[PDB]
Amino acid sequence: GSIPYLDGTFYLNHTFKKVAITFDSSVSWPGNDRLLTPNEFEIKRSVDGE
Amino acid sequence: TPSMMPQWSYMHISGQDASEYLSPGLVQFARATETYFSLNNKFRNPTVAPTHDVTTDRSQRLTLRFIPVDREDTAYSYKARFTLAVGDNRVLDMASTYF
Amino acid sequence: LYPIPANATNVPISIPSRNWAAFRGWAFTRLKTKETPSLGSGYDPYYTYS
Amino acid sequence: GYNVAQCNMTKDWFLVQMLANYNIGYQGFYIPESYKDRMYSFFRNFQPMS
Amino acid sequence: INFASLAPRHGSRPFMGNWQDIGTSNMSGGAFSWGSLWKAWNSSTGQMLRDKLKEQNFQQKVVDGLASGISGVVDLAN
Amino acid sequence: LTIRGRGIQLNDESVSSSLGLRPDGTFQIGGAGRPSFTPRQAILTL
Amino acid sequence: YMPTIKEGNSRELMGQQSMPNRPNYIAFRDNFIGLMYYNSTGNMGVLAGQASQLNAVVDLQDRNTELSYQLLLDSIGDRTRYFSMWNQAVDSYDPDVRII
Amino acid sequence: GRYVPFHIQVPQKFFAIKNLLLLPGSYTYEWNFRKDVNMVLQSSLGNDLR
Amino acid sequence: MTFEVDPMDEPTLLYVLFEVFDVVRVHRPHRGVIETVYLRTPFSAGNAT
Amino acid sequence: KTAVDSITQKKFLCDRTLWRIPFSSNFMSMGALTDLGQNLLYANSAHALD
């Protein structure tokens, strides 16, 4: 069928909870307290949603 | 730029753009033959973002969150009052604000 | 904190290449998973322990 | 061997039409931008079949 | 007091935008680009899906961000 | 010093730089900021 | 011990024996641990000069200030004593219970 | 139909030579192709054509 | 590092505290201004310009 | 009138596009060579990413 690795019809992006980025196992990349949850990027808050 | 690795400049990663490192001549040729033989899509034109005096290195938030200082209610309408604060070394574009 | 699976006896860890300047020493201990809140997380609907 | 677009149109003829209509063909055929493909144009009404 | 260092550099040359661009718009006489260009009772299926695809995407001429495409002619829908 | 500015005078200092540190790979500078009008840049631009 | 499952009072039921429910205490932590948010940059505390709201409190997820305060309290003073101002009363087991 | 003789044109996609302007000379041009059905075909259900 | 521990039937974690230096300096040039600068040497803090 | 108690579910779809985390100080497109990319901290030092 379709081959997302080649034709680029990505369809599974719906899923993705959160992503954390760390350099030297010490520092988070946007670590200057930029985002609301600056520790890591949150794609979707499941049920918590305060 | 001081820390520009020369391999970058040779490989047209940063430095002079297409209209300048080329010989004047090709430039002209190209300008003339634009209509029929394109030749703009075959050289590279580097783009470089600025480094200093554009972004604050010190710890600073992006999406500030203000809470209602005082709130009033009525049978048909209600009132909400916020103490919007904009500290120094900042600028707030009201277009982003939204209740 | 590094995870340890059930009935597992060998726990390898790693730190990628970095600078160990003025490093002071190690200290370690072991604790149960279901008795430790998830680090830097607001609310954990699964933390059922008191 | 003198066919193109998987239809019985000779390569020379296709090249001639494309050149006459949009000056395209000496640097790789591509779909012309819609603002050149008016209704009484060639590509807009080129319909191969099989 | 020169602010050229703040701008993106297009290669040994600051990317200074045109100074003639400060907004002004009102009810009449102000027009901006990017216009509104655009159980089947009828089972054709085909053109239908194709048309839906067309409906979700775009095309015009001042869309010249980046490149128009190879050999050329200058056209309309300004 | 003390130019009138625009009705409320403001003081003027050029070497009033207090926080000499800058965050390199190691440091992490927390909240800061002392608003001072640079003599030439800020005032003339104002 | 419930001798029979038959609902409603009956002759068998009178033999049932009771047992008190287990003890279960509940209170705040040793130092109100967890009451204040610590080491979670999401809901981090803030203390900044009102002129410039840039907070001067910059926590991390790596620090563990709760355990650090526990150890510091152990260090700079005695710990067996109890202070009721901030629930300062360290937890411990009965040594005859831990070791038989 | 099930059985179809085809005639097609395949472009050149490698970025190094996709837009190269070839100066006069006599160069050798060699490339491979895939005879595997599953990869060189696309199916609505994606069923294994082999 | 490689640790070997006795088996347990519950998921568990090994918490290794890499003891480091952790210092904060607080400075105040003028009234109503607090400026703090942090540091951890063996595991440095956030990156910047 | 006789409607059962309701619980609301929310989810989103974002197909065919790939999420992006630009290595820039302020998540913008100020240039092809983002300033963080050329920052002196990463110029001449070894780093590891987790």
Swiss-Prot record, chain B:
It is found in: Virion; Host nucleus. Induction: Expressed in the late phase of the viral replicative cycle. It comes from the Viruses. Belongs to the adenoviridae hexon protein family. Major capsid protein that self-associates to form 240 hexon trimers, each in the shape of a hexagon, building most of the pseudo T=25 capsid. Assembled into trimeric units with the help of the chaperone shutoff protein. Transported by pre-protein VI to the nucleus where it associates with other structural proteins to form an empty capsid. Might be involved, through its interaction with host dyneins, in the intracellular microtubule-dependent transport of incoming viral capsid to the nucleus. Homotrimer. Interacts with the capsid vertex protein; this interaction binds the peripentonal hexons to the neighboring penton base. Interacts with the hexon-linking protein; this interaction tethers the hexons surrounding the penton to those situated in the central plate of the facet. Interacts with the hexon-interlacing protein; this interaction lashes the hexons together. Interacts with host dyneins DYNC1LI1 and DYNC1I2; this interaction might be involved in intracellular microtubule-dependent transport of incoming viral capsid. This is Hexon protein. The chain holds residues 3 to 101 of 952 of the full protein.
Swiss-Prot record, chain D:
Disulfide bonds: none annotated. Transmembrane segments: none annotated. Coiled coil: none annotated. The record marks G25 as: Involved in interaction with pre-protein VI. It is found in: Virion; Host nucleus. Induction: Expressed in the late phase of the viral replicative cycle. Belongs to the adenoviridae hexon protein family. All late proteins expressed from the major late promoter are produced by alternative splicing and alternative polyadenylation of the same gene giving rise to non-overlapping ORFs. A leader sequence is present in the N-terminus of all these mRNAs and is recognized by the viral shutoff protein to provide expression although conventional translation via ribosome scanning from the cap has been shut off in the host cell. Homotrimer. Interacts with the capsid vertex protein; this interaction binds the peripentonal hexons to the neighboring penton base. Interacts with the hexon-linking protein; this interaction tethers the hexons surrounding the penton to those situated in the central plate of the facet. Interacts with the hexon-interlacing protein; this interaction lashes the hexons together. Interacts with host dyneins DYNC1LI1 and DYNC1I2; this interaction might be involved in intracellular microtubule-dependent transport of incoming viral capsid. This is Hexon protein. The chain holds residues 753 to 802 of 952 of the full protein.
UniProtKB/Swiss-Prot annotation, chain E:
One of its GO terms (cellular component) is viral procapsid. Residues 1-30 form a propeptide. Residues 39-56 are annotated as: Interaction with hexon protein. One of its GO terms (biological process) is microtubule-dependent intracellular transport of viral material towards nucleus. Ubiquitinated by Nedd4 following partial capsid disassembly; which might play a role in intracellular virus movement during entry. The record marks G30, A31 as: Cleavage. Keywords: Capsid protein, Cytoplasmic inwards viral transport, Disulfide bond, Host cytoplasm, Host nucleus, Host-virus interaction, Late protein, Microtubular inwards viral transport, Phosphoprotein, Ubl conjugation, Viral capsid assembly, Viral penetration into host cytoplasm, Viral penetration via lysis of host organellar membrane, Viral release from host cell, Virion, Virus entry into host cell. A motif (Nuclear export signal) lies at residues 49-58. Induction: Expressed in the late phase of the viral replicative cycle. All late proteins expressed from the major late promoter are produced by alternative splicing and alternative polyadenylation of the same gene giving rise to non-overlapping ORFs. A leader sequence is present in the N-terminus of all these mRNAs and is recognized by the viral shutoff protein to provide expression although conventional translation via ribosome scanning from the cap has been shut off in the host cell. Belongs to the adenoviridae protein VI family. This is Pre-protein VI. The lineage of its organism: Viruses, Varidnaviria, Bamfordvirae, Preplasmiviricota, Tectiliviricetes. The gene is L3.
UniProtKB/Swiss-Prot annotation, chain F:
Cleaved by the viral protease during virion maturation. May cause the middle segment to be shed from the capsid. Disulfide bonds: none annotated. Residues 1-32 form a propeptide. The record marks A32, G33 as: Cleavage. Induction: Expressed in the late phase of the viral replicative cycle. Belongs to the adenoviridae hexon-linking protein family. This is Pre-hexon-linking protein VIII. It comes from Human adenovirus C serotype 5 (HAdV-5). The lineage of its organism: Viruses, Varidnaviria, Bamfordvirae, Preplasmiviricota, Tectiliviricetes. The chain holds residues 126 to 171 of 227 of the full protein.
